[PDB]
Design a protein around this motif. Sequence first.
Motif, mmCIF file in Angstrom:
data_model
loop_
_atom_site.group_PDB
_atom_site.id
_atom_site.type_symbol
_atom_site.label_atom_id
_atom_site.label_comp_id
_atom_site.label_asym_id
_atom_site.label_seq_id
_atom_site.Cartn_x
_atom_site.Cartn_y
_atom_site.Cartn_z
ATOM 1 N N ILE A 164 18.598 61.269 18.859
ATOM 2 C CA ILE A 164 17.963 61.664 20.087
ATOM 3 C C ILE A 164 17.061 62.882 19.659
ATOM 4 O O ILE A 164 17.755 63.910 19.325
ATOM 5 C CB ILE A 164 19.286 61.909 20.960
ATOM 6 N N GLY A 201 16.129 52.748 17.182
ATOM 7 C CA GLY A 201 16.418 52.142 18.333
ATOM 8 C C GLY A 201 17.033 50.683 18.154
ATOM 9 O O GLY A 201 16.409 49.949 17.317
ATOM 10 N N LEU A 260 13.181 60.087 23.629
ATOM 11 C CA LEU A 260 13.488 59.229 22.468
ATOM 12 C C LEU A 260 12.516 59.343 21.226
ATOM 13 O O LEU A 260 11.472 59.712 21.421
ATOM 14 C CB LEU A 260 13.803 57.861 22.907
ATOM 15 N N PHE A 263 20.960 54.114 20.624
ATOM 16 C CA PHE A 263 20.418 55.043 19.763
ATOM 17 C C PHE A 263 21.624 55.626 19.177
ATOM 18 O O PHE A 263 22.748 55.616 19.738
ATOM 19 C CB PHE A 263 19.381 56.174 20.166
#
Lengths: 100, 100, 100, 100, 88
Positions: B94, B76, B71, B89
């Motif tokens: 990503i 987020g 991540l 997310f």
Amino acid sequence: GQAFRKFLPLFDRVLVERSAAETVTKGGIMLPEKSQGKVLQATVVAVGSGSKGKGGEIQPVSVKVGDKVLLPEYGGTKVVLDDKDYFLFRDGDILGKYVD
Amino acid sequence: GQAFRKFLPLFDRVLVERSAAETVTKGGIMLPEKSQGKVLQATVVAVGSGSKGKGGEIQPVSVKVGDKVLLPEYGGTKVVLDDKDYFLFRDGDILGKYVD
Amino acid sequence: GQAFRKFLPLFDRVLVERSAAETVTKGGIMLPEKSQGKVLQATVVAVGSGSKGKGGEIQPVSVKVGDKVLLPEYGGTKVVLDDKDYFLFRDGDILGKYVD
Amino acid sequence: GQAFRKFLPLFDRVLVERSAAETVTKGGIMLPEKSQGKVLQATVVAVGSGSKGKGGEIQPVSVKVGDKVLLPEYGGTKVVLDDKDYFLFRDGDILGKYVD
Amino acid sequence: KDGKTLNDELEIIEGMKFDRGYISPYFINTSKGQKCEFQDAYVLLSEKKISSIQSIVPALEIANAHRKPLVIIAEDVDGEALSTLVLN
């Protein structure tokens, strides 16, 4: 689109109703009325017509009336119907959809 | 898309679970519970339906449930499922994916 | 794309390894460890899959593993593999490619 | 594209070499070395492959090696080749090109 | 120096004594006298302050692997390193 209480959103805007706040824990402890904050759980009541931003044809709203959805933390607008409070959000801002 | 614990991401959002923080080093030394900070390893549990960001037809998400991903350290959103924390997310945030 | 140490960059991201900074000049003088700063000479160790930003079909990355490239001095993201340092860049953030 | 002294720009970047700074006026008085500042005359030494910002097929750069151009006074990127300094610019920032 | 009894006393301070006390009471291991005592102990001499956890873990790892007590002499120990040491 789908009307509600003589109200009809324009374009892809969606009107949702926030769920009732929590005032008693799983035990017997009551909560202050100034600490619950703002609840992020709501239900869809009214839906707009379609998406104007899409090239050519306009896409319909992706959520259907009666669904339960998780709202974001900062967006939303206040609308008063029969002196009750309802919140208006765009289609893209709805984070997730609860299923049964 | 794939739901999880009666939850379903919308559009191209992806829901992941962070891995446990390290508390015991390779030796016999434990670390403070406040010194672990945040972890960047997570596991995918749910996947959205399709991407609105691509013209014409919507495209699917490029990751599948069960994978291990790296991540980003800034983005987020925090969501709570049965008191267990979950993080949401976008597909483009990503950073990378592990392989086996 | 191509994997490296059980890692695979997503979309058009590229993973590169920074070169080792010099410590002794052409003569017999050896320089401080805090002075060399950052070196922009790096090598490609892993490549992404394809360009998500390209409309319709996805264009592949413009570089291949094994080449030498000149990095920018402000971009990059940090990842740790097997206690070794690697840096991740977008395909469009590379300045130039060395040719043999 | 065209390589120069073991280097090759990526996409539509253009590599140029600044002209020598003048030190003597039309008269016999020469100039201090701290006042001449930066000169805006250079010759193209390397040319990238093609423009990436153009949709569809990539259009080749608008200048060729050996031409004389007028650079902007703010942009640019520094690269050192064989202990000699060269500057890298994007094809869209070259103000003009001399003719003979 | 000024005494505190009717009879003047002679004292010898051998070895190396530099008059500095333990940073935290949690290090005490001998109840009688409130003293910290070790035998055959490693010593880590640091000229600069030891704060970051990354700077202190390897020494503890070495000490644990060799199973010997460790004494840390430096400018000071920050909250992070002190917390790690006391917790361990």
